[PDB]
RNA sequence: CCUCCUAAAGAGUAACGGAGGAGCACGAAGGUUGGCUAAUCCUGGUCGGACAUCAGGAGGUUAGUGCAAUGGCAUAAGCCA
RNA sequence: AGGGCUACACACGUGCUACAAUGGCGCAUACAAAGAGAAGCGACCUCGCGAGAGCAAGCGGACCUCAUAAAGUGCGUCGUAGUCCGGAUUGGAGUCUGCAACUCGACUCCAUGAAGUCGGAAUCGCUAGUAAUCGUGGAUCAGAAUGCCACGGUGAAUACGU
RNA sequence: CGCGGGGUGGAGCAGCCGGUAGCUCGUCGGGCUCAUAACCCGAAGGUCGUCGGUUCAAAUCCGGCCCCCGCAACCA
């Protein structure tokens, strides 16, 4: 993980869209390429798109998601089975 | 020879008989030895029940054994519960540290079975 | 009871290291040294605190914040 | 039978102040707790069944009965009268002194203990538990025991209601949760 | 040779009529004294599961009878000593 | 710009580490060679359990730095156990590089402690300072080697013969 | 309709007493092999047609049914 002394990372713009988003009070799903950045206590409530490398797919944020970032709720690969 | 939840071998020295203890290896065995003020190589046999009973306080201050299991159980089920990629991995049964598992997973997919 | 067939069956004092003694009837023979009594077994200390839930986002907030 | 004696001055009060019973005779009493042994692999080889038996004996000081096949199941492979399982009753005194000891010392010794159910009272007073491992009393020696063995406990009493014995059990300081 | 039905409410009653059994077993599975009461289901309970053993109940012989079927059997003829 | 080349029922190739006592662990202590270094190597001192951090000389270098060689030797301990063997795996917390370590870096600490008890058919290398074993360095390179290319240490067995 | 054989691992031939549950070629796996056929080692494939019962051993002894055989007899 990221050194606690440079702090959490968020892409800038996400940061912006997010704070956007809170000072409407709208629950339009925000579609994002980030998913790099971490989640935030602010971006709890609100649904983001995360894109999986083909697709934006809807994450609802929950208060146990905070730590977490992005892109580990957007799964890219897709495999189903063998047989 | 009673600590925590558990039993403790009696002829096996202190250090490493506490080690049977679940949630604690080496280095948290001597550190409770240290506590205590119980030298290392002396065995189970032939301690006081004072020493004894200053060893489970000290044992007490960890989270160990049931508990420690508990909060084991916890995190996992949390994570599947998210369903993070690590909590997809883990109901999977597939390597969750980033394992090019290619043909060698073989830890968590368990053993080999044959194509039918 | 028939008085042959049983194991024997006698007063013996029991001590957890709480420091509560105990005396009572039992097989073992000998004194008995408990490790926890009910007395001092930790069901109404422990029960709260070793579920241990906590909050992530207080987590996430300690750690690192603004 | 000090259980016993705390039983007849205080739970019994206890009791008639919380149910607001007319008659003392209308409480709940404990009439028998029983402690079964079931052991199918005694089919395989004799012994075990012995040495469980042996061990339930340790655990409370009568001599088990010797339970044997009533009606005989398919899966499992047993002829009907085959010597399949162990129980002891108490009753009385010694019933109550296994009562304090499986309280004040057998229950504390549980691995990794979060309390009894309280839901596991059937619907007619009766309770009935089970441990996992016989090493919990302390009769057993954990040194001696081949036999990793477990049991089940069963307390009879004489509530009407479940609501009741749970009641009763309390009063008795019994765990639950 | 035994049981049921055909057989017409005493007995008996035929067919290459309809259905099943016997050619033994047991020194206890006999005698007697004393005691006991079933199947099945439900709920709870360590391993234990549709199905072992143990508790609380419903049930009331639906079970049992050394083996076919009939008639019997709780005063048990059923189960233990 | 983000992702992939790092996917994973599986099969093969080449390596590393093991399965232990000719060893593991602990404390002390000896003897190399050959290299690299300026957007670089970085002493000493201070702090950090440690990776490292801070300060900051000496040095384009037979001068200073990387840089303590390790096996060895002595003393202690463990006593044949899946172990004080073995380290995979996973959890936590972190260090450095780098706009940036989620996919996907290395290293550290604490915990965790798989398989594995010398390996079927078969199959490879080596004739001497060789094999075997022990460390050391370099290139590429911000970071990222068990690979490659180099260096010394200890140091065998066997060759009747065709 | 009656009477003699009996009914299986992709096919086939399985040791009188019900406790043994196969062998050949086949498919995969790997090195032999100048090549495969190989020799050799190991591995996936069941119900024992079926419904029942005597018995803890049952497909393995018997009562019926479905088929494969074989029978020899019949046919206004």
């Not at chain 1, 797919?57 to 977490?68: A, I, R, S």
């Not at chain 4, 492979?77 to 499986?102: N, S």
């Amino acid at each position: 993980p990221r050194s606690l002394k440079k702090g959490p990372f968020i892409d800038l713009h996400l940061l912006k869209k997010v704070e956007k988003a809170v000072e409407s009070g709208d629950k339009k799903p925000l579609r994002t390429w980030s998913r790099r950045s971490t989640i935030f206590p602010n971006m709890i409530g609100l649904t983001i798109a995360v894109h999986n490398g083909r697709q934006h797919v809807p994450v609802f944020v929950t208060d146990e998601m905070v730590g977490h970032k992005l892109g580990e709720f957007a799964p890219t690969r897709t495999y189903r089975g063998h047989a | 020879a009673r600590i925590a939840g558990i039993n403790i071998p009696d002829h096996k020295h202190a250090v490493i008989a506490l080690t049977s203890i679940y949630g604690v290896g080496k280095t948290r065995s001597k550190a409770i030895l240290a506590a205590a003020g119980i030298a290392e190589d002396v065995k189970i046999s032939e301690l006081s029940e004072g020493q004894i009973d200053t060893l489970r306080d000290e044992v007490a201050k960890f989270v160990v054994e049931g508990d420690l299991r508990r909060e084991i159980s916890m995190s996992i089920k949390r994570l599947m519960d998210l369903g993070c990629y690590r909590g997809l991995r883990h109901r999977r049964g597939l390597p969750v540290r980033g394992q090019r598992t290619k043909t060698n997973a073989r830890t968590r997919k368990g053993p080999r079975k044959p194509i039918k | 009871m028939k008085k042959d067939i049983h194991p024997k069956y006698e007063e013996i004092t029991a001590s957890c290291s709480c420091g509560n003694v105990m005396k009572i009837r039992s097989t073992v023979g000998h004194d008995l040294n408990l490790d926890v009594c009910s007395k001092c077994h930790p069901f109404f200390t422990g029960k709260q605190r070793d579920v241990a839930t906590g909050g992530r986002v207080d987590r996430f907030n300690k750690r690192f914040n603004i | 039978a000090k259980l016993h004696d705390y039983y007849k001055d205080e739970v019994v009060k206890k009791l008639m102040t919380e149910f607001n019973y007319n008659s003392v005779m209308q409480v709940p009493r404990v009439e028998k707790i029983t402690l079964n042994m079931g052991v199918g692999e005694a089919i395989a080889d004799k012994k075990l069944l012995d040495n469980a038996a042996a061990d339930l004996a340790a655990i409370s000081g009568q001599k088990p009965l010797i339970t044997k096949a009533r009606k005989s199941v398919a899966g499992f492979k047993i002829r009907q009268g085959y010597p399949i399982g162990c129980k002891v009753t108490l009753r009385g005194e010694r019933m109550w002194e296994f009562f304090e000891r499986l309280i004040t010392i057998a229950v504390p010794r549980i691995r990794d203990f979060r309390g009894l159910s309280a839901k596991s009272f059937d619907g007619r007073g009766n309770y009935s538990m089970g441990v996992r491992e016989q090493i919990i009393f302390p009769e057993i020696d954990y040194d001696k025991v081949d036999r990793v063995r477990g049991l089940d406990i069963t307390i009879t009493t004489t509530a009407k209601s479940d609501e009741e014995g749970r009641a009763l059990l309390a009063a008795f300081d019994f765990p639950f949760r």
